[PDB]
């Protein structure tokens, strides 16, 4: 439905929708921009991520409330409504994963873009995994793992340990290990090594870069405190 | 789309959607319940009002952000997106007004139901008026006025001055006078008389009723403080 709108107008309206807290609109505008076929700049990648993270975050919060009610109840209504919300969440994840596969990742040649999109691929398979059951589930978990792992391998070769995209990727992969893969030791090890290697590289940063990096390091610290 | 779902299942799912903070879903479930054609109980009227007030409240907050940006800017993008949000807001108001006209109000014979629905009719024409311009606008303002006035006339004849529906109606009609009708003296007079008449009737209430009434009286007081 965004085929007739200029790319620049889609980006401008995504920024307006963000100000208005209209995240579903923001995501639809950014989906339209991606579908223009041109690569995304740093700022535009961030708009894409913010939009979908807010949309899926609403769905995940709702699914958790409903799952909790359902588990306490164990008529068909709670299960039906939890399934409705689940299906819509799955649709959003499939949409994002589709944008990454068609064709964001394959055109992304710089480290900052390729790591960003592979992290997103890990995150959206992780959201699918949160609602998945059984073994169908195992392949979903492995897709998240594989994406995160490719992102980590590139990040370690191509970016400094304080790079905020590298830090956010490690943060999220540590959450994947703790919450999805039942590997809390791997989670803690990854968060600790990431934190320590970033701390040792802070001396190289400007005031503003230091602020960006230390913000995510605090998130790593908050998790370590929760987990230990 | 809710034609195939049981009335009771629609009500149950509206309550679930409220817990999950899924207000668009909650409104769609309550629209389905209304369209079953049976009158609504006290609790169900309140579910209907909560659902739509949250949906339209999101739209109004967004429209205000966009209108502000537009007015500061004065390409077509800000105006286009503000119009998109405005049109969707208008659609929600028209939907609620349609449910009231077909056929909630005409079947509502008790004071508590008839006052509730006429207040809602006032509120949704008021939301239309907030975005309306010119004289088309005058007829919208008069529709809000007329609805509120009929509600007030019934409320004064049929309910005690501490009744929370009567209090909320007067609160909202005072806001209509202050913000829409450019009648801040009428707003202040109405809020003051309502507050004073409720205060004099508090002695008749149980602890729980006193709590319900004084909560809305505080809202009247907060407005008087803002306005004087
Ligand atoms: O509360 C959280 C914490 O999740 C973290 C924490 C550190 C890194 C990454 C995440 P995630 O990508 O799971 O949101 N996530 C969350 C956010 C929203 Cl908007 C909804 C829900 Cl249900 C969970
Ligand atoms: O901030 C307010 C205050 O409005 C009042 C105050 C007293 C009585 C009635 C109302 P209203 O029906 O205008 O929301 N309303 C408001 C609520 C949301 Cl969710 C969004 C927006 Cl933009 C305004
Ligand atoms: Cl459902
Ligand atoms: Cl490439
Ligand atoms: Cl638009
Ligand atoms: Cl009647
Ligand atoms: Mg073009
Ligand atoms: Mg399912
Ligand atoms: Mg390229
Ligand atoms: Mg039936
Ligand atoms: Mg218009
Ligand atoms: Mg009747």
Q: Whole-angstrom Cα distance, residue B132 to residue B140? A: 8
CA distances from B193 to A18, A121, A227, B152, B200 (A): 42, 61, 58, 13, 11
Question: CA angle, corner B141, sides to B74 and B223, nearest 5?
Answer: 85
Cβ count near B26 (within 10 Å): 25
B16 vs A77: CB contact, 8 Å cut-off? yes
First to last CA, chain B: 48
Cβ count near A189 (within 10 Å): 13
Q: Whole-angstrom Cα distance, residue A103 to residue B23? A: 34
Q: Whole-angstrom Cα distance, residue B75 to residue B92? A: 28
- Picking from B185, B170, B177, the residue whose alpha carbon sits closest to that of residue B220 is B170
Interface check for B4 against chain A (CB to CB < 8 A): the answer is: no
- Picking from B190, B151, B158, the residue whose alpha carbon sits closest to that of residue B174 is B190
Q: What angle separates helix A207-227 from helix A164-175, to the nearest 10 degrees? A: 10
Q: Looking at beta carbons, which residues of chain B come within 8 Å of A75?
A: 9, 12
Residues 6+ apart with CB under 8 A from A171: A191, A194, A216, A219, A220, A223
Q: Whole-angstrom Cα distance, residue B7 to residue B29? A: 9
Q: Whole-angstrom Cα distance, residue A143 to residue A125? A: 6
Exposure string over B110-119, b if 16+ CB within 10 A, otherwise e: ebbbbbbbbb
Architecture of domain B1-228: Up-down Bundle (1.20)
Q: Whole-angstrom Cα distance, residue A210 to residue A214? A: 6
B12 vs A77: CB contact, 8 Å cut-off? yes
Is residue A34 a contact partner of residue A11, using CB atoms and an 8 Å limit? Answer: no
Chain A closest CA to B169's CA: distance in Å? 29
CA trace torsion B37, B38, B41, B43 (10° rounding): -50
- Picking from A87, A101, A108, A171, the residue whose alpha carbon sits closest to that of residue A143 is A101
Residue B130 Cβ inside 6 Å of ligand 2? The answer reads: no
C-alpha atoms less than 13 angstroms from C-alpha of A105 in its C-beta half-sphere: 18
Residue A225, H or E segment = helix A207-227
Q: Looking at beta carbons, which residues of chain B come within 8 Å of A87?
A: none
CA trace torsion A94, A80, A58, B64 (10° rounding): 110
Interface check for B21 against chain A (CB to CB < 8 A): the answer is: yes
Q: Looking at beta carbons, which residues of chain A come within 8 Å of B61?
A: 20-21
Residue B172 Cβ inside 6 Å of ligand 2? The answer reads: yes
Is residue B77 a contact partner of residue A10, using CB atoms and an 8 Å limit? Answer: no
- Resolution of the experimental structure, in angstroms: 1.7
Q: Tell me whether residue B61 is exposed, middle or buried, using C-beta atoms within 10 angstroms of its C-beta: 0 to 12, 13 to 18, 19 or more.
A: middle
Chain A residue with the nearest C-alpha to that of B11: A77
Residue B65 Cβ inside 6 Å of ligand 2? The answer reads: no
- Rg of chain B over Cα atoms, rounded to whole angstroms, equals 18
- Picking from A200, A122, A216, A211, the residue whose alpha carbon sits closest to that of residue A167 is A216
CA distances from A105 to A115, A151, B171 (A): 9, 11, 55
Q: What six digits make up the tokens of B184?
A: 């801040």
Q: What six digits make up the tokens of B164?
A: 């929370």
Determine the distance from the C-alpha atom of residue B188 to the mean position of all C-alpha atoms in its chain, rounded to a whole number.
19
Q: Coil, helix or strand for A39?
A: coil
Q: Whole-angstrom Cα distance, residue A59 to residue A87? A: 10
Is residue B171 a contact partner of residue B191, using CB atoms and an 8 Å limit? Answer: yes
Is residue A113 a contact partner of residue A45, using CB atoms and an 8 Å limit? Answer: yes
This entry's atomic model was obtained through X-ray
CA distances from B40 to A162, B57, B99, B139, B183 (A): 59, 23, 12, 29, 34
**Sequence spans of domains, chain B:** 1-228
Q: What six digits make up the tokens of A50?
A: 């913010």
- Rg of chain A over Cα atoms, rounded to whole angstroms, equals 18
Whose CA is closest to atom 10 on ligand 1? Answer: A172
A81 vs B19: CB contact, 8 Å cut-off? no
SS (HEC) of chain B: CCCCCCHHHHHHHHHHHHHCCCHHHHHHHHHHHHCCCCCCCHHHHHHHHHHHHHHHHHHHHHHHHHHHHHHHHCCCHHHHHHHHHHHHHHHHHHHHHHHHHHHHHHHCCCHHHHHHHHHHHHHHHHHHHHHCCCCHHHHHHHHHHHHHHHHHHHHHHHCCCCCHHHHHHHHHHHHHHHHHCCCHHHHHHHHHHHHHHHHCCHHHCCHHHHHHHHHHHHHHHHHHHHHC
Q: Whole-angstrom Cα distance, residue A31 to residue A10? A: 9
Is residue A32 a contact partner of residue A3, using CB atoms and an 8 Å limit? Answer: yes
Q: In chain A, count H helices and then E strands.
A: 10, 0
Residue A132 sits at φ, ψ, to 5 deg, of -80, 150
CA trace torsion B9, B11, B14, B20 (10° rounding): -70
Q: What six digits make up the tokens of A40?
A: 């995304």
């Amino acid at each position: 439905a965004m085929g007739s709108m200029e790319r620049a107008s889609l980006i401008q309206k995504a920024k307006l929708a963000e100000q208005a807290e209209r995240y579903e609109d923001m995501a639809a505008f950014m989906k339209g921009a991606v579908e223009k076929g041109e690569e995304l700049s740093c700022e535009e990648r961030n708009l894409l991520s913010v939009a979908y993270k807010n949309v899926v975050g609403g769905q995940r919060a709702a699914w958790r409330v409903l799952s909790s009610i359902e588990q306490k109840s164990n008529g068909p209504e709670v299960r039906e409504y939890r399934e409705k919300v689940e299906t819509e969440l799955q649709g959003v994840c499939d949409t994002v994963l589709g944008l990454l596969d068609s064709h964001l990742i394959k055109e992304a040649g710089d480290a900052e873009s390729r790591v960003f999109y592979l992290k997103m691929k890990g995150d959206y398979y992780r959201y699918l995994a949160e609602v998945a059951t059984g073994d169908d589930k195992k392949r979903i978990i492995d897709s998240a793992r594989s994406a995160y792992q490719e992102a980590m391998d590139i990040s370690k070769k191509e970016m400094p340990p304080t790079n905020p995209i590298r830090l956010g990727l490690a943060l999220n992969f540590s959450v994947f290990h703790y919450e999805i893969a039942n590997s809390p030791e791997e989670a803690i090890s990854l968060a600790k090594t990431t934190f320590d290697e970033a701390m040792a590289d802070l001396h190289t940063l400007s005031e503003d870069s230091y602020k960006d990096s230390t913000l995510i390091m605090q998130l790593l610290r908050d998790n370590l405190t929760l987990w230990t």
